[PDB]
């Protein structure tokens, strides 16, 4: 229940959208069905990654070692660009989803287009991709960062 309430980014309530997003964006995310489908697919992939994590990590040890400190980079961006985390921002959630998807392409460990190479590359950056998608979520970028 906590996972769903923290990573869903419901597009039903309008007051919360006005509080977190500008008016030019709330109507777009409320009327467009494609955006809602993309958001639902994002949440489903997050749930699959959650299942994969619970399979790989028994005993509930959430401490891991990873290359980039995403939270510290988010904090640095907040301090550099003077976010003022009190007013609604200008960031379409579809922009966040597309940015994460295109970023996942560039971070390559195994170089090649072979299906074997594709699978090896997907495995090598699996944990980092899961962490990145769990950090740069559509809801977190609009409710927490």
């Amino acid at each position: 229940k906590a996972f769903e309430k923290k990573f869903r980014f419901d597009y039903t309530n309008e007051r919360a959208l006005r509080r977190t997003l500008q008016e030019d964006l709330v109507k777009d995310v409320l009327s467009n069905a494609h955006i809602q489908n993309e958001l639902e697919r994002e949440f489903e992939r997050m749930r699959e990654d959650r299942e994969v994590l619970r399979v790989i990590f028994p005993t509930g040890d959430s401490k891991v070692v990873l290359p980039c400190n995403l939270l510290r980079m988010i904090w640095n961006a907040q301090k550099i660009f003077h976010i003022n985390p009190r007013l609604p921002s200008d960031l379409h959630p579809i922009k966040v989803v597309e940015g994460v998807k295109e970023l996942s392409k560039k971070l390559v460990i195994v170089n090649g287009d072979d299906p074997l190479s594709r699978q090896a590359q997907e495995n090598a950056t699996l944990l980092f991709n899961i962490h990145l998608r769990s950090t740069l979520c559509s809801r977190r970028m609009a409710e927490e960062f």
Binding site: N13, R15, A16, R19, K79, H82, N84, P85, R86
Partner: protein
């Protein structure tokens, strides 16, 4: 002008957890008109206070009445008029956190502004109406003066 907030406070309590530091004292003060709580760290060695004292607290963005918005560097050779001429204790710091009873649907009725004056912390907790000039990562002057009434 640049007066972010002004009110009269009376020292309702001094540091209740005990004197952690000898030269710095914690003060819990209440308001008179807007009824907002204040927590402040003061240099008790140079500006001694005790229980029951009252003072005027005027949080201001700049010390100059014309609001020329100085950069924030120490230039003692400045002959321009300043608010500090009519205040006994002046501190300069930056606001670093703003809290509130914000809900996911409607706004916040109570705010809590946290400011650090180079180590000495102050928390001003009150209704949201009186705290509107506080924007995080901005410079603030303290400008308190004791009252004899």
């Amino acid at each position: 002008a640049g007066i972010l907030f002004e009110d009269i406070f009376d020292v309702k309590d001094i540091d209740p957890e005990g004197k952690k530091f000898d030269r710095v004292s914690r003060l819990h003060c209440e308001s008179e008109s807007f009824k907002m709580d204040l927590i402040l760290d003061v240099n008790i060695q140079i500006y001694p206070v005790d229980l029951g004292d009252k003072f005027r607290l005027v949080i201001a963005s700049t010390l100059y009445e014309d609001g020329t918005l100085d950069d924030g560097e120490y230039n003692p050779t400045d002959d321009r008029p300043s608010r500090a001429d009519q205040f006994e204790y002046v501190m300069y710091g930056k606001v670093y956190r703003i809290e509130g009873d914000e809900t996911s649907t409607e706004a916040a009725t109570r705010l809590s502004a946290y400011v650090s004056y180079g180590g000495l912390l102050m928390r001003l907790q009150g209704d949201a109406n009186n705290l509107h000039g506080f924007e995080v990562d901005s410079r603030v002057y303290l400008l308190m003066k004791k009252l004899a009434f």
